[PDB]
Amino acid sequence: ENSKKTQELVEKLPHEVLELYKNVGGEIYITDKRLTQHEELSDSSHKDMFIVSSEGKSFPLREHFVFAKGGKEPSLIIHAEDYASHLSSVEVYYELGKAIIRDTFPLNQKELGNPKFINAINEVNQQKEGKGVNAKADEDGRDLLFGKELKKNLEHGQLVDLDLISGNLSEFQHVFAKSFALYYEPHYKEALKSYAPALFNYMLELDQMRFKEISDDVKEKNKNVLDFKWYTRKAESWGVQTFKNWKENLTISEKDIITGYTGSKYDPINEYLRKYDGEIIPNIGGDLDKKSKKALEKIENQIKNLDAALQKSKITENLIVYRRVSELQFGKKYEDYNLRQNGIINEEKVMELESNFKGQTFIQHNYMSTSLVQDPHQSYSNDRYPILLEITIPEGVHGAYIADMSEYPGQYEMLINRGYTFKYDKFSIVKPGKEYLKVNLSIYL
Ligand SMILES: O=C(CCN1CCCCC1)N1CCc2[nH]c(=O)c3cc(F)ccc3c2C1
Ligand SMILES: [Cl-]
Ligand SMILES: [Cl-]
Numbered sequence: 456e457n458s459k460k461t462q463e464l465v466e467k468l469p470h471e472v473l474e475l476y477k478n479v480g481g482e483i484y485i486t487d488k489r490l491t492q493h494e495e496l497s498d499s500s501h502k503d504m505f506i507v508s509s510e511g512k513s514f515p516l517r518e519h520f521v522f523a524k525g526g527k528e529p530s531l532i533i534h535a536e537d538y539a540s541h542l543s544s545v546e547v548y549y550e551l552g553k554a555i556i557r558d559t560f561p562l563n564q565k566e567l568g569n570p571k572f573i574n575a576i577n578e579v580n581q582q583k584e585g586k587g588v589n590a591k592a593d594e595d596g597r598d599l600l601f602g603k604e605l606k607k608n609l610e611h612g613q614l615v616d617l618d619l620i621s622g623n624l625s626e627f628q629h630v631f632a633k634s635f636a637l638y639y640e641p642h643y644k645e646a647l648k649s650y651a652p653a654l655f656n657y658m659l660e661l662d663q664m665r666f667k668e669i670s671d672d673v674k675e676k677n678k679n680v681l682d683f684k685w686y687t688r689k690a691e692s693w694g695v696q697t698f699k700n701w702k703e704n705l706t707i708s709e710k711d712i713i714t715g716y717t718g719s720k721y722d723p724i725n726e727y728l729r730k731y732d733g734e735i736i737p738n739i740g741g742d743l744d745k746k747s748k749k750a751l752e753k754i755e756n757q758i759k760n761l762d763a764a765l766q767k768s769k770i771t772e773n774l775i776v777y778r779r780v781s782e783l784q785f786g787k788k789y790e791d792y793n794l795r796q797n798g799i800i801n802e803e804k805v806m807e808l809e810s811n812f813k814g815q816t817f818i819q820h821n822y823m824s825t826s827l828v829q830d831p832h833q834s835y836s837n838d839r840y841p842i843l844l845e846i847t848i849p850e851g852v853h854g855a856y857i858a859d860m861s862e863y864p865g866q867y868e869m870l871i872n873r874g875y876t877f878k879y880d881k882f883s884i885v886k887p888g889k890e891y892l893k894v895n896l897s898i899y900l
């Protein structure tokens with residue numbers, strides 16, 4: 456009923472826009488209950504939350520009829536209604552617009568700094584009434600699209616650049632989402648065109664070609680590699696489903712050591728494995744005292760069990776995984792390399808790491824703990840580690856999703872087998888509040 460009309464409202468939107476939202480695990484929920492009673496808005500925080508409508512009016516979330524929940528599992532929750540009302544429809548398209556520009560890659564990374572957006576915004580901000588000398592400022596575009604706070608921080612005629620966008624991010628996301636909403640709601644479109652022509656044309660290009668272009672480019676990339684980025688919804692579903700069979704084919708001992716390995720067994724195991732950097736140097740003469748011998752045998756048995764578990768698992772498609780590390784990644788002598796000072800990545804150090812390591816191969820003799828998603832957990836994040844390894848795993852590699860067995864499921868761990876050869880492919884400085892060095896590696900089978 457009203458649920459159908461709500462669906463029909465969304466289905467008027469371009470299929471391409473809905474595609475981009477779906478790609479990042481975006482879900483659209485239509486509900487007859489209050490938004491704050493929905494499963495997705497359960498957190499105690501959503502109780503005392505407020506939202507601001509397209510026209511700048513504040514309401515309690517509980518009282519409102521649509522909300523784009525952002526973050527790592529984006530959701531658009533919509534109260535089912537008639538939506539014959541254009542005043543209502545425009546708010547849905549507004550939150551959807553926000554879901555696009557704020558929550559969906561790649562738009563939420565590049566778009567607002569794009570010449571096209573900045574150019575359109577500058578032109579609207581510079582509209583004139585007259586055509587000759589000393590023509591009066593025309594505030595019609597700013598009044599239609601710019602929020603209260605943005606009108607306070609930006610004057611008419613004043614120039615917008617990347618640093619102004621970065622300092623007023625949510626305010627420019629509003630401009631984008633409201634342009635989007637007015638463009639797509641048929642009874643608001645003509646006013647957008649009349650009063651902010653530059654932003655109308657900006658949205659017309661997105662609607663008529665460039666949403667589609669961005670979408671096809673995503674489809675193309677997904678054909679070559681699977682990359683969940685920081686989004687957890689699709690990642691967790693893929694991890695659980697893909698390795699379910701493998702998990703049923705583990706022994707009790709194998710499951711126990713997988714768990715133990717994510718806990719206190721981690722260091723003793725990986726230290727043992729890294730011992731001689733792959734050189735075979737037998738220890739001969741004398742013997743270990745009884746406790747050290749027992750401890751060593753125990754570690755050897757754990758490695759036997761982990762080896763056996765991971766041999767039973769094969770990654771079935773090209774996959775990107777993520778791992779945070781320190782400068783010790785490049786060797787013991789880099790321990791105090793001081794790659795990052797005051798949250799700033801030293802540019803010349805990156806140049807010499809690049810000079811020394813780019814193209815070089817190496818063996819990780821340790822098992823390789825990685826995350827199926829980027830930076831999911833406080834233990835291994837940008838704040839503590841100045842280097843993110845972005846690792847391309849080719850189909851056929853022995854590794855497995857172990858998060859549901861881990862003492863830390865929130866890490867979304869993909870455990871890759873020991874003894875693979877890796878290559879340093881690329882070095883990139885990533886800016887925000889700390890910068891970091893992204894190092895692309897590939898496994899070489
Ligand atoms: O040093 C440890 C672990 C030490 N540990 C075991 C547990 C108790 C003592 C403390 N590392 C190196 C860096 C790192 N980086 C990740 O991005 C990551 C992602 C995952 F999903 C899982 C593990 C990791 C790890 C694991
Ligand atoms: Cl390690
Ligand atoms: Cl490290």
Ligand code: NA
Pocket residue numbers: none
């Ligand atoms: Na094999």
